[PDB]
Design a binder for this molecule. Structure first.
Ligand SMILES: N#CCC1C=CC(=Nc2nc(Nc3cc(C4CC4)[nH]n3)c3ccccc3n2)C=C1
Ligand SMILES: N#CCC1C=CC(=Nc2nc(Nc3cc(C4CC4)[nH]n3)c3ccccc3n2)C=C1
Lengths: 286, 286
């Protein structure tokens, strides 16, 4: 494939140091030549037709070039495994930090994570990518107090389908005006706004350690989302009006009324320019 | 591929009788064993990566089972050509008939074609397929006075992307309510309604031989669609109120207000059950 190496043993290039987490396990790896650190996802594939299922993820990582999105370092197919090697963020996932410290982020910490996460998302949406699995477990801290967005395992990339859709020959007398005007679902915000709702839930998850409805039987959670008004902060006196106002723009069930990442970047809750609160957080867990 | 034969010469199975039309030419073919007739599209492919571009078309033909959609009879890859063999409709395309007779269809003929075309489209939409190139040139007459819809060269099939989208693991606390409720763009009517607008233009094309804006420089046509109110019949006294009312439900620039195929099937303009007018038309061109 475009970005996947064949016929080579990944362990002739990358040395497994340990496990980071657990369709496989994720390892801490170290380049045998350069000492550069990596997370190595090792995905067990039965056949080669399965590689097609993991290729959109790999293409997204390979195609993205943003400070707050993790980079692809290498990928290998070898002895029925797909190895994906991804840049290493030494601070760990936001949710893992909250559980180790046994406390949520403070509001000033949430603003930094929110602001940088929004930058990542805005870039994705601009490039016709929907993340589709945003949560605190997929926001990773660097040693320098910045964040990177990760895990594009179920992301959608609409660039090739937009390319195929904008393609025609001969005079299109029968073309619908919404297709003429580039107002199909691929170019419209509608489907990208699913990420904006998830940002909102991630903000509450960072404010309260666990996401809304964490106490319910898992079988009830989808029903609860459908039935209920959007969630709010449990202890709203703890939080600024700008935090709560930001949330209301994300956690809006009317998708048309819900804000885009572009609109959200102008909100005073993300008008910050220092990661000092995150540097203080990662130093405390060290 | 799933539906494409390799290593076999298509002309050891199918005999070319002549040309029907002109990325290639379309031939009239005859099965050497069974005498069954076929249209043979022979598409020149440079490499094998090009087959991927023609596979959605082939899969649609192979997967559809409807009286008013043309069936796949065979496909072959041989000596750098993709052969697609499609069931034969002995009456030709609706637009070719109008040009040979030098006249449009009558309203009773349009109702039959409309009613059967709508049945085909409704089936497609139910099965998550957008045709994307509906026009009189892709509606074919059978010897019995029925129609079949053809040419899925630029169709979209959203079944595998809906399958991939409905797929998740673990508890989805971060899932947007529109994703919970199955109100993403794949399940919503919005993008399928592009076909409904094109049905409307095809109806006018059948009423007047050529589609709206046929007299303009081709470079102006997309602009004209964007700028103008929806087209109407040029000589509206010639046509019933049910024809004109049907058109208004199709040719509606507000996509939400525009009717679905399902709604259109209940309209009195398509409440017919005899193809006698088309039998009279094809007999006249013979
Ligand atoms: N799948 C997926 C995302 C993910 C996120 C975090 C994770 N565990 C984990 N991940 C990391 N760091 C990490 C993970 C990645 C890459 C997203 C796999 N890049 N950096 C650390 C770093 C330091 C201590 C502990 C860590 N644990 C394992 C997998
Ligand atoms: N591409 C594409 C659609 C198309 C539609 C019509 C066409 N020409 C054509 N097509 C047909 N018939 C036909 C074409 C097909 C099949 C859609 C290619 N099935 N039957 C006839 C039949 C009798 C006299 C003349 C005909 N001419 C050639 C191609």
């Amino acid at each position: 494939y475009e970005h996947v190496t064949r016929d080579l043993n990944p362990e002739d290039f990358w040395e497994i140091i340990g496990e980071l987490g657990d369709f496989g396990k994720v390892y801490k790896a170290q380049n045998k030549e350069t000492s550069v650190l990596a997370a190595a996802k090792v995905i067990d594939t039965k056949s080669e037709e399965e590689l097609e299922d993991y290729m959109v993820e790999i293409d997204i990582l390979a195609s993205c070039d943003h400070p707050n999105i993790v980079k692809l370092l290498d990928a290998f197919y070898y002895e029925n495994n797909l190895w994906i090697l991804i840049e290493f963020c030494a601070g760990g996932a936001v949710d893992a930090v909250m559980l180790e410290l046994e406390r949520p982020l403070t509001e000033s910490q949430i603003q930094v994570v929110c602001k940088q996460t929004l930058d990542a998302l805005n870039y994705l949406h601009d490039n016709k990518i929907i993340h589709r699995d945003l949560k605190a477990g997929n926001i990773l801290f660097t040693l320098d107090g910045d964040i990177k967005l990760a895990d594009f395992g179920v992301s959608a990339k609409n660039t090739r389908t937009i390319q195929r859709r904008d393609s025609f020959i001969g005079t299109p007398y029968w073309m619908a005006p919404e297709v003429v005007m580039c107002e199909t679902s691929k170019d419209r915000p509608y489907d990208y706004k699913a990420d904006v709702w998830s940002l909102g839930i991630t903000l509450i998850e960072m404010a309260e350690i666990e996401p809304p409805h964490h106490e319910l039987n898992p079988m009830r959670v989808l029903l609860k989302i459908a039935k209920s008004e959007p969630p709010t902060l449990a202890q709203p006196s703890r939080w600024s009006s700008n935090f709560k106002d930001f949330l209301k723009k994300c956690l809006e069930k009317n998708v048309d009324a819900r804000w885009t990442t572009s609109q959200l970047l102008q909100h005073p809750f993300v008008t910050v320019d220092s990661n000092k609160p995150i540097r203080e957080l990662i130093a405390e867990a060290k």
